[PDB]
Design a binder for this molecule. Structure first.
Ligand SMILES: NS(=O)(=O)c1ccc(C(=O)NCC(F)(F)F)cc1
Ligand SMILES: [Zn+2]
Length: 257
């Protein structure tokens, strides 16, 4: 179906998913001079102490670390959000080279990669109902730059060999996603969409200002993954990012002065 190549990449997606040309698409460029500080924005509450990771899956577009979301364990609250959003999975988008890979950009600057921690609003009961609602998801986005290693990422990098190709999964219990956060939780926020088909307009985006640093060796391991299934021709999983989309009639708000 859809993917990231010239024949099936982002510029094609609108033919099967016409919302691609919609009014609240993601990602976007964050213009730091135009985003306005909103003193009414609350601190984010990231409550991940009770997180229960279960499995890691190569789905042919990225790899997802999945959590048990059958109760209010790992949740995101506060900031621009009303109510409680449960962590369901995280994944990354990254580049073939260090100068590209993020989906959001900051003053047109691309980072090497971007982590998305995906949460759904518990008022809608299940994830499939939530993605049908304009306030159904909250995705916490964190930029990755290349520098020092991120110790809390190494457990993820070391299992990637076992899920090299599409449809492979592995047990992945006891992973603590607090080890992927930066020091500061200052953020930008705007209403947007899923960045992969079906491109549903159901996301409150919360993008942290402070990137995390990962090492060149860590990001090199992401780039050894494959988009293809086992035995099929090898296509390295790189450049699985959607470019910035028109901001249209939206305002990006900053939590910080
Ligand atoms: N974080 S993100 O890249 O915008 C992103 C997060 C989640 C999903 C997702 O659950 N797609 C499967 C669904 F909902 F069945 F359509 C897609 C994109
Ligand atoms: Zn994503």
């Amino acid at each position: 179906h859809w993917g990231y190549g010239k024949h099936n990449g982002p510029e094609h997606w609108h033919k099967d998913f016409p919302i691609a040309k919609g009014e609240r698409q993601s990602p976007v460029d964050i213009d730091t001079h135009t985003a306005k500080y909103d003193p009414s924005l609350k601190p984010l509450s990231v409550s991940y102490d009770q997180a229960t990771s279960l499995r890691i899956l190569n789905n042919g577009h990225a790899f997802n670390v999945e959590f048990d979301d059958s109760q209010d364990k790992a949740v995101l609250k506060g900031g621009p959000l009303d109510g409680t959003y449960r962590l369901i999975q995280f994944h990354f988008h990254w580049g073939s080279l260090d100068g590209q890979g993020s989906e959001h950009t900051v003053d047109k600057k691309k980072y090497a990669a971007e982590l998305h921690l995906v949460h759904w609003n518990t008022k809608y009961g299940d994830f499939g109902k939530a993605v049908q609602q304009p306030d159904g998801l909250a995705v916490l986005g964190i930029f990755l730059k290349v520098g020092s290693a991120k110790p809390g990422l190494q457990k993820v990098v070391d299992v990637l060999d076992s899920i090299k190709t599409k449809g492979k999964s592995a047990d992945f219990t006891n992973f603590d996603p607090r080890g992927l956060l930066p020091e500061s939780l200052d953020y930008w926020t705007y209403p947007g969409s899923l960045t992969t088909p079906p491109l549903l307009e159901c996301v409150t985006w919360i993008v942290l200002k402070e990137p995390i640093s990962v090492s060149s060796e860590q990001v090199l391991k992401f780039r050894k993954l494959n988009f293809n299934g086992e035995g099929e021709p090898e296509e390295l999983m790189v450049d699985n990012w959607r470019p910035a989309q028109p901001l249209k009639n939206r305002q990006i708000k900053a939590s910080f002065k």
